[PDB]
Amino acid sequence: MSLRDKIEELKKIEKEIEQGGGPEKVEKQHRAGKLTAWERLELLLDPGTFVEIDKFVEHRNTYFGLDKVKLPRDGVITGVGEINGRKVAVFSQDFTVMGGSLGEMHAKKIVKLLDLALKMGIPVIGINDSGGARIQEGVDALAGYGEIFLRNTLASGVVPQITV
Amino acid sequence: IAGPCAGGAVYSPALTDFIVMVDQTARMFITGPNVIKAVTGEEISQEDLGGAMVHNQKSGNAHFLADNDEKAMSLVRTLLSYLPSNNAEEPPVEDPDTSLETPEDILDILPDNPNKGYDVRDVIKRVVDHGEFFEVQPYFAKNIVIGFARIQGKTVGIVANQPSVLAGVLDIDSSDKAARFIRFLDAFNIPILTFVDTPGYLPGVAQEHGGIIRHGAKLLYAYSEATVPKITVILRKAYGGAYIAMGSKHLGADMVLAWPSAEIAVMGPEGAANIIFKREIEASSNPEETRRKLIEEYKQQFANPYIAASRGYVDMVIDPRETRKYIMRALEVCETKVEYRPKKKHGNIPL
Amino acid sequence: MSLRDKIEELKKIEKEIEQGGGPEKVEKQHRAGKLTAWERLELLLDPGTFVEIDKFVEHRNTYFGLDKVKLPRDGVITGVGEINGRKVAVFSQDFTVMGGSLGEMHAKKIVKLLDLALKMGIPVIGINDSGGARIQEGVDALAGYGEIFLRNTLASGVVPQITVIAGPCAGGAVYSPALTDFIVMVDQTARMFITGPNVIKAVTGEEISQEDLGGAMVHNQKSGNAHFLADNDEKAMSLVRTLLSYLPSNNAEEPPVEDPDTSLETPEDILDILPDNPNKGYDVRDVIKRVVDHGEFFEVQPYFAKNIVIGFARIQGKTVGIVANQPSVLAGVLDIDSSDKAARFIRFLDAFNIPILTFVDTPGYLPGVAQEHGGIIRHGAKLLYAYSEATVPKITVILRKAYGGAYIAMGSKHLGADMVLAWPSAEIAVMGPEGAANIIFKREIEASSNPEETRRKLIEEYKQQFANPYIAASRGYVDMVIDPRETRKYIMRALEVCETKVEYRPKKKHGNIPL
Numbered sequence A: 001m002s003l004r005d006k007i008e009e010l011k012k013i014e015k016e017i018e019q020g021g022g023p024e025k026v027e028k029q030h031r032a033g034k035l036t037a038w039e040r041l042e043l044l045l046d047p048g049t050f051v052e053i054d055k056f057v058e059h060r061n062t063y064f065g066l067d068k069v070k071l072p073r074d075g076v077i078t079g080v081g082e083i084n085g086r087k088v089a090v091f092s093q094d095f096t097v098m099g100g101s102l103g104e105m106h107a108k109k110i111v112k113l114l115d116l117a118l119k120m121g122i123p124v125i126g127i128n129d130s131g132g133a134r135i136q137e138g139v140d141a142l143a144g145y146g147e148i149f150l151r152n153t154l155a156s157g158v159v160p161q162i163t164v
Numbered sequence B: 001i002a003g004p005c006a007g008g009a010v011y012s013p014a015l016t017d018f019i020v021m022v023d024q025t026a027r028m029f030i031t032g033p034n035v036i037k038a039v040t041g042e043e044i045s046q047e048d049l050g051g052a053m054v055h056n057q058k059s060g061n062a063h064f065l066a067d068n069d070e071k072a073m074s075l076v077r078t079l080l081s082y083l084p085s086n087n088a089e090e091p092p093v094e095d096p097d098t099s100l101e102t103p104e105d106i107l108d109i110l111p112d113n114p115n116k117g118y119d120v121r122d123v124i125k126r127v128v129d130h131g132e133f134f135e136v137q138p139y140f141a142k143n144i145v146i147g148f149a150r151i152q153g154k155t156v157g158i159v160a161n162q163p164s165v166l167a168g169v170l171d172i173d174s175s176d177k178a179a180r181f182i183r184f185l186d187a188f189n190i191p192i193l194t195f196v197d198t199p200g201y202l203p204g205v206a207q208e209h210g211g212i213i214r215h216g217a218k219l220l221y222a223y224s225e226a227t228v229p230k231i232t233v234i235l236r237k238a239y240g241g242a243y244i245a246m247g248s249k250h251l252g253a254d255m256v257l258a259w260p261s262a263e264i265a266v267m268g269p270e271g272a273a274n275i276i277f278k279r280e281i282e283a284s285s286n287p288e289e290t291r292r293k294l295i296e297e298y299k300q301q302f303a304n305p306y307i308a309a310s311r312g313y314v315d316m317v318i319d320p321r322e323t324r325k326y327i328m329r330a331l332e333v334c335e336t337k338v339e340y341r342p343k344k345k346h347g348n349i350p351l
Numbered sequence C: 001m002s003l004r005d006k007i008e009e010l011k012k013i014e015k016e017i018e019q020g021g022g023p024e025k026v027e028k029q030h031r032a033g034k035l036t037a038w039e040r041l042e043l044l045l046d047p048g049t050f051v052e053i054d055k056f057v058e059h060r061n062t063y064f065g066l067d068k069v070k071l072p073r074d075g076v077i078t079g080v081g082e083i084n085g086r087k088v089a090v091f092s093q094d095f096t097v098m099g100g101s102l103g104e105m106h107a108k109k110i111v112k113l114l115d116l117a118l119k120m121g122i123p124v125i126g127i128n129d130s131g132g133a134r135i136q137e138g139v140d141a142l143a144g145y146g147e148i149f150l151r152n153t154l155a156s157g158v159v160p161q162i163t164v165i166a167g168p169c170a171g172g173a174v175y176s177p178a179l180t181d182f183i184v185m186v187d188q189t190a191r192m193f194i195t196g197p198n199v200i201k202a203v204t205g206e207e208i209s210q211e212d213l214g215g216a217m218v219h220n221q222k223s224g225n226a227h228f229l230a231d232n233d234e235k236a237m238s239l240v241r242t243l244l245s246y247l248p249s250n251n252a253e254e255p256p257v258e259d260p261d262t263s264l265e266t267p268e269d270i271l272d273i274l275p276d277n278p279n280k281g282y283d284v285r286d287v288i289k290r291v292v293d294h295g296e297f298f299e300v301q302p303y304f305a306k307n308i309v310i311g312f313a314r315i316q317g318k319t320v321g322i323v324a325n326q327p328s329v330l331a332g333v334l335d336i337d338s339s340d341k342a343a344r345f346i347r348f349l350d351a352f353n354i355p356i357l358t359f360v361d362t363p364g365y366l367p368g369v370a371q372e373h374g375g376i377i378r379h380g381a382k383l384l385y386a387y388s389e390a391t392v393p394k395i396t397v398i399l400r401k402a403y404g405g406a407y408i409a410m411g412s413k414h415l416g417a418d419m420v421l422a423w424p425s426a427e428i429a430v431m432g433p434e435g436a437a438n439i440i441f442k443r444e445i446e447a448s449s450n451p452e453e454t455r456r457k458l459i460e461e462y463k464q465q466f467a468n469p470y471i472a473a474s475r476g477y478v479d480m481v482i483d484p485r486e487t488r489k490y491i492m493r494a495l496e497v498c499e500t501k502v503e504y505r506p507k508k509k510h511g512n513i514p515l
């Protein structure tokens, strides 16, 4: 309703997105000896320096029951932070959301982040943790990968690219 | 302009970036009152034809009104303080504000009632260094606000809808005003900070017959062409072509933030819902109940800022109290933004 | 099942797409006096040269019943064809598919087409025929328009962009046209407006028809938005082909050379155009046509600011742009509207490497409070900027009057003209000779027993002694005072030399032209 009611609603929506694939999937990540997508960033970056973008992105493909589910961040955290006072573009795949599978929107977020790293002249860090293509999205997932590969090639010898 | 400025004299000032005019003593016109009277019959004083207020308020020719020569000299010194010497230099860094916090009372500026306005300068000043805003062309096309300010000591230019004047619409004069300013900022390497709250273009036969099409396109061209950093904050309404024009992601903004009060829609929610549900409204056993149900529902489900955030058109929906901090950090990253344009002698902007 | 079975299937899928919105929507289109999107391309492009792309594109948004319909081509045909043997990118909106509304995929098709034109260095022809945003698709529709405008802006002054308005063009749809170089509007069937009459009526109480608000003639005559008025879709297609024949494919080419007139002569009757009475007007196009190849003049914006004339011609087969004061309309004064018309045309010419040929006969600027209050300073300054900035060859011929600021603005030597010629009828002065004598001789005239007689003699002596073309020629401002019958020869010879003209400009992202 009011501006402060809408701020409280915004906070609800963000907490939900920040669950990832939920407490049970998160617990399983930890049992496997693995940190979550957000815990990794929290260790990688200078404290308090990370700005997320595209947190509210949602998938568009409806196939095979995708129209009945919400997929937080579409499985990937993208943003810019600092490492020892220098700007770095980072992405961190969230395995808790459909095995960290790469949907169309997931790919588009990484493409956007790579485009941005190149344009701003900052290193990119990719943290990979993914079963592969979200199979349900069909050829859009391959389009997604291809565009990423294209961005990696243009950035090659321009900004350093590190993968984990 | 610190005195008369008549005939061919006027064109040099028009070809410079900014014109300061001194209140009672400055006058500028191509043709004087005697010749106008001899040709048209119109009786007018030099002040009313081309005084400093006329050019600041009506003609759109001048950017500042100084009360006297002293004030005009200081005004010039202050304007230069925001600018580089040339286009190969970064603008200067002055008196940095490195605090991150936006005050709590930023939450009390927008009215509860969406039909009411507010002064957008109350938002600007709660986001920029030290609350300092140096307004350009304040008397002309007041439905849009433009000027200089600083973020962490570095010059930014501001473009903002003014919802307290003509509902914050865009029109012929506001397009001209903002478009030229944007092009100046771009040329001299200054970031562009845009604040959005607009329901669309001013309707009117005179707007259409006056060329709202070619004039409005100048603002699209200006943002699109610009390679400086472009950060945009949607405060409230952003409908139709006006959403696109006001530093949208689609014209190459680097970051788009939306307050939770933002309302992004293809047209006015009322007009959209009337078209889309045209049939259901006409087949209901009470149209105005269903039409009002559907309009509220359209606003809630379709016009909220999360639809555009879900597509990545809005990078983040944010607490208004985070606004200064997002801008500061975006601008730290964007200090090294390099963007290329096709090789051309120049473009063909609409005129 | 088999490959040939799959070919038969493919052909069926294609035939269904080619129906557009269906037989009844096509009948309706034709009843409105409009051709289909495909019939238009057929006339526009050389026979059998069109290659369509993205024919099989389908919309993705499912809102408001959109998941229960097929929309062929998503309402737009895109591809590449030839016009007179040269490659051109084309799009053609299909009004029979949801009123030619712009969806997400429709827009992406057009974006892809513009990206391609730019990359390949070829012109773009947009045929618009659209109710506006597909509102059922919401912010994606707006995203679409936005990306189109960005592509138009990037392409601006790199490849020629021509828009034909051949039906409705409402809302944000209007801005892509505005960002293109030239707009052809079809009489009666074309309409363009941001806001429609019903919204205007609801908000301002003004009652107006669509034709009176945004018809082809309105935009040609009142608003200054459009450059040509075609009767017909057929006529609009032939107009586009003729226009392109003047233009290069892109900004890295010299313009095309076509059917050279190699004669040097200017007919004797060029001496009979300017009246004996210097207060009488004439049609400047009678001078233009006795100087350019074959007498052929292709006029741009002929209904708007008719006190100035612009268009394309050829000299020895090579494209030139014409800018000329029109003494038969508002005594050939400069004003807001003429300044806009000429300045934008000149910037186009310069961007695409076309010489500028100026014909000067102007007493100055239009006096009036509305001119001052409407910004004649900033608008007038656009013309000065446009000439000053131009690095293409600039040839200026002064036929008669050239007074004050307008002398300067009309391609003067001081703004970088490569050659300035004056007829013996030329009258170059710092302002109108009456106003100048009134200032210079203020004391003699006021002192006199008969101020009007005294004033009258001084004006005559001033015109004779100070305003003749030989004063400016004595300083080298006018390169030559010429016999009017020598005009064509001078222009040809100068243009031959100026083919290799190289001029630099300071490095900048761009300038800050007044708007």
Ligand SMILES: [Mg+2]
Binding pocket: B215, B351, C379, C515
């Ligand atoms: Mg104007």
